[PDB]
C-alpha cells in the first residue's frame, strides 16, 4: 500500500503561534480522474477521529479557517494558525487515491503554558477495600506544567518501588496542564505492618520535593 | 445531523466470528451517493480500513483482509453490518463505523466500540471511594479507584455527569492482567461534604453499573 510519511512526530508551540505539519506519499496522489484524494484528520484521546480537510484544501463544516491545507503530487502540508488549547490532538494525513486508504503516523500537538506546580493529594485505602484483604494508597498529582515529573513512594521513610502503578493524562485542553495518578497496592497485612505512608513529587517548579503523607493510626 | 453508533460484543475468543452492527440516523442508504465504512484502530496504533458499502449495493474490502470480511446492510432500518471470521488477538481494536463523502474520506464517525479478542474471563471492577485523609484548605480533592476489570472499557462520571469541571480521569493501566483506573474531582470545601458527591462507574462487558458516594473519613 501507499505509505504516508508524516513529520514531525511531535510539536510543542507557544499559544497563538503557527503549527505546520508535512505529509509525503510514496507515490503521486493524483488519481487518473485528475483529482487528489488527500485528507486531514485529528483525534483526541478517548475520541473518534474528526475530519478537518478533504481533498487537499477543503475545510469540513465547523472547521475554522485558521486551519488550512495545501500541496500537490506527493507533498502536502497542514497549517494551524493561532494554536489554542482546544487544538490539542494527534493530527494525521490520509490518502484514498489508492486502495487501501492509508494514514500518516500522526503528529502530537502540544501547547506551551506558564510553569505550574502540581497539586498533590494522598488517599489511604478505603474501608471497602480493606474488607477484601487489599490496600491501595493513591496519590494524585494534578494540573502541573511542564510534563516532566517523578513520584516516589516512601513507607516508614523507606522507598518502595514494587506494587506502584502510574498513569498520566494527555495535556488538558482547557488549562494546558498535565496530571498524574500513582497507586501503591499492598495486601491489608503488609499495609498494617507499617505506619507512615508518603507520596513524593519532584518537579521543576519546586527546589525541594513536594511531600504528602499520613500515619495509619488516625 | 448525521450520527452513527456501533454495537457488538466487548470480548470474544480467538477463532470465533465477530458480528458488529452500525446504526445510523440523519441520512439514508437509499439516498444516492451515500456510503458507510468500517475502520479499526488497535490500542495505541494506526487506523486500518476494513470495508465500505454503498447506496447501490457496491461493496469494497481491504484486499489483505477480504477472506475474513463480510459487509452488508439493512437500508430499511438504517443499519450496516460487519462480520469478521476467525478472529485472533491482532483483531483486538476499537472498531468505528463512518459516513463517507464518496471517495474514502469519512466525515462523521461513530464513538467506536472496543473489541478485545481474548480467552481471559470477563471481570467486573471493584469500585472504591477516595476520601481525603481525616483531619482544612479552600479546595478539596476526592477520588474514585476502579480496580481489577477486564476487558476495557469502563465509563466513569461524577454525580451522573452533573459534576464535570475539575475532573481528571486517568488512562487505564494493566495490573497483573487486569485493568485499573482512577479519577479525581476537585471542588471548593464549601461544596463537600455538605453536598453529595458520587462516582458513577459502568463496565458494559460485565453489565456492571455501580455508584459510590464519597463519605468523610
Amino acid at each position: 500500500d501507499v505509505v504516508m510519511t508524516q513529520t514531525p512526530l511531535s510539536l510543542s508551540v507557544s499559544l497563538g503561534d503557527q503549527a505546520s505539519i508535512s505529509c509525503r506519499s510514496s507515490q503521486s496522489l493524483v488519481h487518473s480522474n485528475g483529482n487528489t484524494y488527500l485528507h486531514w484528520y485529528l483525534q483526541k484521546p478517548g475520541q473518534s477521529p474528526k475530519l478537518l480537510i478533504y481533498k487537499v484544501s477543503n475545510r469540513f463544516s465547523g472547521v475554522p479557517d485558521r486551519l488550512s491545507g495545501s500541496g500537490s503530487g506527493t507533498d502536502f502540508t497542514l497549517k494551524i494558525s493561532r494554536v489554542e488549547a482546544e487544538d490539542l490532538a494527534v493530527y494525521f494525513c490520509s490518502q484514498s487515491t489508492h486502495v487501501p486508504p492509508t494514514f500518516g503516523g500522526g503528529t502530537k500537538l502540544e501547547l506551551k503554558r506558564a510553569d505550574a506546580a502540581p497539586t498533590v493529594s494522598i488517599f489511604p485505602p478505603s474501608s471497602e477495600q480493606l474488607t477484601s484483604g487489599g490496600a491501595s494508597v493513591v496519590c494524585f498529582l494534578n494540573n502541573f506544567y511542564p510534563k516532566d515529573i517523578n513520584v516516589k513512594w516512601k513507607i516508614d521513610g523507606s522507598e518502595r518501588q514494587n506494587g506502584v502503578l502510574n498513569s498520566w493524562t494527555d495535556q488538558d485542553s482547557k488549562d494546558s496542564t498535565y496530571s498524574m495518578s500513582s497507586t501503591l497496592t499492598l495486601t491489608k497485612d503488609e499495609y498494617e505492618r507499617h505506619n507512615s505512608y508518603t507520596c513524593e513529587a519532584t518537579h521543576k517548579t519546586s527546589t525541594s520535593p513536594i511531600v504528602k503523607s499520613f500515619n495509619r493510626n488516625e | 445531523q448525521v450520527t452513527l453508533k456501533e454495537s457488538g460484543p466487548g470480548i470474544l475468543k480467538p477463532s470465533q466470528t465477530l458480528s458488529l452492527t452500525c446504526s445510523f440516523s440523519g441520512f439514508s442508504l437509499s439516498t444516492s451517493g451515500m456510503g458507510v465504512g468500517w475502520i479499526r484502530q488497535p490500542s495505541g496504533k494506526g487506523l486500518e480500513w476494513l470495508a465500505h458499502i454503498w447506496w447501490d449495493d457496491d461493496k469494497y474490502y481491504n484486499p489483505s483482509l477480504q477472506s475474513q470480511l463480510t459487509i452488508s446492510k439493512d437500508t430499511s432500518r438504517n443499519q450496516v453490518f460487519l462480520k469478521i471470521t476467525s478472529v485472533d488477538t491482532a483483531d483486538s481494536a476499537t472498531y468505528y463505523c463512518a459516513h463517507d463523502r464518496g471517495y474514502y474520506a469519512m466525515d462523521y464517525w461513530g464513538q467506536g466500540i472496543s473489541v478485545t479478542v481474548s480467552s481471559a474471563k470477563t471481570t467486573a471492577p471493584s469500585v472504591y471511594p477516595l476520601a481525603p485523609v481525616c483531619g482544612t484548605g479552600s479546595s478539596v480533592t476526592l477520588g474514585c479507584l476502579v480496580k481489577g476489570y477486564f476487558p476495557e472499557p469502563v465509563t466513569l462520571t461524577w454525580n451522573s455527569g452533573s459534576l464535570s469541571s475539575g475532573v481528571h480521569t486517568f488512562p487505564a493501566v494493566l495490573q497483573s492482567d487486569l485493568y485499573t483506573l482512577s479519577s479525581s474531582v476537585t471542588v471548593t470545601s464549601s461544596t463537600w461534604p455538605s453536598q453529595s458527591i458520587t462516582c458513577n462507574v459502568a463496565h458494559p462487558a460485565s453489565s456492571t453499573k455501580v455508584d459510590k458516594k464519597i463519605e468523610p473519613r
Partner: peptide, 9 residues
Amino acid sequence: REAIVKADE
C-alpha cells in the same frame, strides 16, 4: 490499485 470513486464534489 486505484480507488473507484463512488461520489464526489
